[PDB]
Design a protein around this ligand. Structure first.
Ligand SMILES: OC[C@H]1O[C@H](O[C@H]2[C@H](O)[C@@H](O)[C@@H](O)O[C@@H]2CO)[C@H](O)[C@@H](O)[C@@H]1O
Ligand SMILES: OC[C@H]1O[C@H](O[C@H]2[C@H](O)[C@@H](O)[C@@H](O)O[C@@H]2CO)[C@H](O)[C@@H](O)[C@@H]1O
Lengths: 437, 437
DNA sequence: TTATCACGTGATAAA
DNA sequence: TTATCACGTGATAAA
């Protein structure tokens, strides 16, 4: 898709309140005539850097702030320049999450953190430590239930356990993140992931469990605990499960440290609708009535708008979310974040399946998370170099074929030409190419 | 995942009644103690041939019959051997759809065909031809609505229009399909796709429209028509849209010819649960109460079970489905079907976007749909041949380097060794490798 | 059918 | 950093 003047197309993840955001777009259209289409395509955070490099893509893209710095480095986002009065409507730290190289690159919407979700009926007293989960599962298995199921395919859900005992992504020193200092391979990281793998080896968890599998098992009352964000609450509300949201369990006496995301909206740098997107975001979405329509669909978490967050903060589920977010850290937005997430995703999946041990999976993840992505020109230098190496050799064999009179067969590879050249220079070449004078 | 003795894991597409099928699995577990997990992973029809080749994968896989012959050729499915009395409970033609090389390779469940779905309130008199859709869109656009939106990303939804004027997939002659005779590049195929592209060029349809985009626009009353199967009816029931299901529009005075699918269940050839899967499928799912629980979730279409289909056939939506299925054809199940679907998917997307003209997109699709997939041994013959070609050359240069005394530099590519060999034989080599005596 | 060379990125390493 | 050779499949074609 290409965006056109006069219409607004929005991308937002399929687990967010896209139907509520479409209501906000319908009110926008009612007051300005600008149609607003909300879409939730799969892997949007991956498709956007591909399509936006040539002017394609949506007008607005919704994602956690950790992806936007990579978008900004590639020149895909329009600089966000809201009035000082509007910046004051949002919490400063939410603005910090969308500041890259001194510039605001997106509008912050909501603060998201994973928490522990548990079935009050099956488990009135949720556990406080990770270590007492294997025993808890033994009790529930005798009843036909399981202790805990959560998404093992995305390292977002596993990172709180990895980070508890000291595992970290990029070290922050003296005002900046050091991208060569990755801490996914330390003792704290190995201890957390080994406990995860140990849960699978002892049949307390399934390596293939994914989002929908874990969501269904909890919402059907088959498992007593899940780990998820505020977006998942509305599906449990409609189910018959009476649930609570509380602090994540400790590991080795240390709190789980979830990576905190700030759902943000960036404007495509190629959109002839920048003013309309700025108007819709500032005056329609980032208002009480606008965030309410989205929040009633799928809860947003702790919204960046002060006026509406003073209402939402009364929800004890939001207070638990903040409790977990205080125990965690706001994610970096640096372009390296995507390479960090891929490497950890592979490390968690490979160790949970048994394809790799914990030590080997994390050692390679540390190398990958710090691997410098080669520039386009570097790739091009290599391609041209090998193209030139072949062209020189091709010319040589072209000259030997046309001028050697080498008593060649009708069809032969250039190796047979090279062999003929060797005997002419006084060499002996055997069949496997062994050569001597 | 690997399957284990005593439990049943099922894969079914995410647009089908997986929650209803889970109810059937829960009743199974109640009467036998065998837990049954229903999962709907993305692209299951693609993951199954990958994971099942090494013993992984689910116990049972649900898909339209067109994929199963390729699974059977790869040896991934257990032969289905139901008693004669049970075969008689299902319509013979549904059994034919799952017969490959004389053997039954799956249990048939339901017959699916696309129909025309329309909003009765916005459009009480649905159109009968494709040709009158562009004018109909002009009327609805002035009201703020659109005429027709359907999935343009999957060629299943576009094939009825391609096949109307004479386009076909594989020709059937003398009792068999000829896999070298592909008819996606004839005048009938070009005419149907050109009309599709013409709908996009004249702004009546969007090239990027996908399933969820089309489903939402119809279920929100923004478009007057969509093309979908019976699985989509329950989402429109919960919406406020008053809809009807009728025959697909004609093109060039000829009926649209949808490819008819038979939702089938195959048993993994690597499952130590074959008897349990056979028991669950025959005595729990393929019963009235079992198909009812699934059908109440997402409608199945015209079920293969005679006793329950005599009930469902009274539904006028099912009668329209059958009306369309009679105008279409049962899909082949031959292994080439997957290569046919990929080629047409690329042809439709490339022409709808403008990356390729209709003529070029269909010409390449015909070549691809008939392209013989090279055997593993053929791939291996090529790999070894090039490995051997490099090994011979490597030895030669190894001998020249160690015995030439060629006045070489410290580091040089093998091209510089070859150059030195040329002057020793009496040649002149320039820098670009131009050589002569 | 088999065959040759192209092709761009990977594995490895000198510096 | 740049450098070399490996690597398996693609483009092309003789037969
Ligand atoms: O798992 C890697 C993934 O983690 C985070 O993604 C979250 C997202 O922030 C949430 O809003 C929600 O959608 O769950 C996602 C995990 O599936 C990072 O934001 C993302 O960049 C990263 O790839
Ligand atoms: O579009 C190619 C696709 O068409 C059919 O898939 C259908 C399927 O049969 C229906 O049950 C439903 O899920 O919609 C699908 C299209 O998205 C073929 O069965 C399938 O093999 C083919 O790839």
């Amino acid at each position: 898709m290409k965006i056109e003047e006069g219409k607004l197309v929005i991308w937002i993840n399929g687990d967010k309140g896209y139907n509520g955001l479409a209501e906000v777009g319908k009110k926008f259209e009612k007051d300005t005539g600008i149609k607003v289409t909300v879409e939730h395509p799969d892997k949007l955070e991956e498709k956007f850097p591909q399509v936006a490099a040539t002017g394609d893509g949506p007008d607005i893209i919704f994602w956690a702030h950790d992806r936007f710095g990579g978008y900004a480095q590639s020149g895909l986002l329009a600089e966000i320049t809201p009035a000082a009065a509007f910046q004051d409507k949002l919490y400063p730290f939410t603005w910090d999450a969308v500041r890259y190289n001194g510039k605001l690159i997106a509008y912050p919407i909501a603060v998201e953190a994973l928490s522990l979700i548990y079935n009050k009926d099956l488990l009135p007293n949720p556990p406080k430590t990770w270590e007492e989960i294997p025993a808890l599962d033994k009790e529930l298995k005798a009843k036909g239930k399981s202790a805990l199921m959560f998404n093992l395919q995305e390292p977002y859900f596993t990172w709180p356990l990895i980070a508890a005992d000291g595992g970290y992504a990029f070290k922050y020193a003296a005002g900046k993140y050091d991208i060569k200092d990755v801490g996914v391979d330390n003792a704290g990281a190995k201890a957390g992931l080994t406990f995860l793998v140990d849960l699978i080896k002892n049949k307390h968890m399934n390596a293939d469990t994914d989002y929908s599998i874990a969501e269904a098992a909890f919402n059907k009352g088959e498992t007593a605990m899940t780990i998820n964000g505020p977006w998942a609450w509305s599906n449990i509300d409609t189910s018959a499960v009476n649930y609570g949201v509380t602090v994540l369990p400790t590991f080795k006496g240390q709190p789980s440290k979830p990576f905190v995301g700030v759902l943000s909206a960036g404007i495509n740098a190629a959109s002839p609708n920048k003013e309309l997107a700025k108007e819709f975001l500032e005056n329609y979405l980032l208002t009480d009535e606008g965030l309410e329509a989205v929040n009633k669909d799928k809860p947003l978490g702790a919204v960046a708008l002060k006026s509406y967050e003073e209402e939402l903060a009364k929800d004890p589920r939001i207070a638990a979310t903040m409790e977990n977010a205080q125990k965690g850290e706001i994610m970096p937005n640096i372009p390296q974040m995507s390479a960090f997430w891929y490497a950890v995703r592979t490390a968690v999946i490979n160790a949970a399946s048994g394809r790799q041990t914990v030590d080997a999976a994390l050692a390679a993840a540390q190398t990958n998370a710090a691997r410098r992505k080669p520039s386009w020109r570097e790739r091009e230098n290599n391609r041209r170099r090998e193209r030139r190496r072949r062209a020189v050799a091709a010319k040589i064999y072209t000259g030997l074929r046309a001028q050697g009179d080498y008593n060649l067969p009708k069809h032969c590879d250039n190796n047979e030409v090279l062999k003929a050249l060797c005997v002419e220079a006084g060499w002996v070449v055997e069949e496997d190419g062994t050569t001597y004078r």
